[PDB]
Amino acid sequence: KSEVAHRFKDLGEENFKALVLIAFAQYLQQCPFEDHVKLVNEVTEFAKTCVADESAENCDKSLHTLFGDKLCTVGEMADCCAKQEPERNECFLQHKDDNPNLPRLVRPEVDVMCTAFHDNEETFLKKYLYEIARRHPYFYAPELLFFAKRYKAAFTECCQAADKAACLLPKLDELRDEGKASSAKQRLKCASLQKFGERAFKAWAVARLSQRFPKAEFAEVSKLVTDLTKVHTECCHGDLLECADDRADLAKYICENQDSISSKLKECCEKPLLEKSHCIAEVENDEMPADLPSLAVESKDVCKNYAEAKDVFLGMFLYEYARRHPDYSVVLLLRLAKTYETTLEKCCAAADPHECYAKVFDEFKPLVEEPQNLIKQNCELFEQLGEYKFQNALLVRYTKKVPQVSTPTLVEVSRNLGKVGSKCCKHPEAKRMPCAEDYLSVVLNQLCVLHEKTPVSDRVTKCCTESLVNRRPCFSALEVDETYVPKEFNAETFTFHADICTLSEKERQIKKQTALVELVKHKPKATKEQLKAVMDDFAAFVEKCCKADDKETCFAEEGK
Ligand SMILES: O=C1CCc2ccc(OCCCCN3CCN(c4cccc(Cl)c4Cl)CC3)cc2N1
Ligand SMILES: [K+]
């Protein structure tokens, strides 16, 4: 009956403290690491008292009460502790900064990190949880413990290898890419739940789980959708203790009932508890039952059953169409289910419904042939340019559409909107649509949450406040901003020094793409010839005066 005690017994002490540390770093993305650890230790020791006696003092309080009490104890000046608890926790949820403007983590040397991992392993492992949750306020918390376990394993093995750098560095880069991809993929779930509602998320789950569990019964999928929606709703609301506990309660439920869900869950249900829940979320699509019936033109009871249970009918409709088309993207199947729902709203309210919806599956062909041709026409362009050059064509085009968007948002989003060809144009003609359009939904959400932080354009808000399924077609038709009169000029941004040649090639290309965006802001009417000219100009400039011994002398130059 005492909450924190029950959550401490289900998760154990090790996962309990780590989840509390994540919840504090995401709510307070500015407090020092040492301050949060003390509060986490003060919370953990009190939770041990309620485990010893659940009827003790303050044990009958809610987690939001206990969290917000010690969080309201630490440049951060909004008075989020607004009287009661409902106004308090939601204040911490709103002020979660998707772009907290924090200095990026500087990766020390391998032996420096290994010696820190050897001295105090706990403090070392807590900072990795701290900084990531600090910079990713909506990071999947139970998934972050999975990365922390793998972040611990890499240092455990590589710090005793003959070549620690050749061992540790390939593993720190992949976990760096896995976490950012996981955070962005999780940021899409919270935006769908918060900005569009639970019904929008459960439709995504029904579609994605039907492709992944096509042999599972419809009632089986609906139970998995109910639990998964409850899990992420708790995670997105900052209630990370119930999220991971229900995620563990769901991981065991899927494993205790594999015969009714999927056959690919054998290896997933053998891994430890953390890897178990991660493996299920990344398991492959099971095979669909052969010779499956199409639909049945169909029932005279369609409108009779569409009225007796609309969501069950549409949910089963989305279940039946998603389980048969694993090659369709999730956003497409939501368009097909939405189109089928709107047609039944007219036909059943019309005179003759049977003939009214007699060609509803023929008007799906234009909706299906749109992502096909898009991917078929963009992998052609991406192949004939490569990733970097294709990003530059996206940088100039996107900056011309909305020049008011900050250069970091433009550079970051255009760099990620260019990585679509690297990830998905390598899959066959059947795995392109779910790969490309669902990754695009993740990046377009990053742009929407970045623009939500600092809005400057009404057109971007219109596409972000529109249907989540039609975000990509909306942004593509934003046209060129012909009214960008404030095309300011500058020269300090174009002034470069010798510190640039100490960075990596990746970090140097970002700065060139940064000036490419600012150059377009300096003259939005610049042609691609003059744009590519200055792109090769500054590239050859920094190339000639770093292979030469000029230091901070040749960079003190100009051209424009
Ligand atoms: O940061 C900002 C701020 C301003 C802004 C305004 C408009 C805007 O348009 C976005 C719509 C692009 C859709 N493309 C379709 C083509 N595409 C692709 C690339 C390679 C392979 C494959 Cl297969 C594909 Cl589909 C990626 C997605 C973006 C921005 N961005
Ligand atoms: K990156």
Swiss-Prot record:
Glycosylation sites: 9, 48, 127, 152, 189, 215, 223, 266, 271, 300, 304-305, 310, 338, 365, 400, 426, 431, 481, 512, 521, 523, 532, 560
Organism: Homo sapiens
Single GO BP term: negative regulation of mitochondrial depolarization
Binding locations of (4Z,15Z)-bilirubin IXalpha: 230
Sequence positions bearing Phosphothreonine: 407, 409
Name of the protein this chain belongs to: Albumin
Gene: ALB
Effect of residue 560 to E: In Gent/Milano Fast
Keyword Heme: no
Compartments in which it is found: Secreted
Outcome after substituting residue 60 to N: In Malmo-95/Dalakarlia
Record annotation: effect of changing residue 523 to E: In Castel di Sangro
Marked site positions, Not glycated: 1, 17, 38, 61, 70, 83, 96, 126, 149, 164, 171, 180, 185, 195, 202, 230, 252, 264, 276, 346, 359, 376, 389, 401, 419, 423, 453, 462, 487, 506, 511, 525, 528, 544, 547, 551
Disease linked to the protein: Hyperthyroxinemia, familial dysalbuminemic: A disorder characterized by abnormally elevated levels of total serum thyroxine (T4) in euthyroid patients. It is due to abnormal serum albumin that binds T4 with enhanced affinity. Analbuminemia: A rare autosomal recessive disorder manifested by the presence of a very low amount of circulating serum albumin. Affected individuals manifest mild edema, hypotension, fatigue, and, occasionally, lower body lipodystrophy (mainly in adult females). The most common biochemical finding is hyperlipidemia, with a significant increase in the total and LDL cholesterol concentrations, but normal concentrations of HDL cholesterol and triglycerides.
Residue ranges of domain Albumin in the record: 1-176, 177-366, 367-560
Membership in a protein family: Belongs to the ALB/AFP/VDB family.
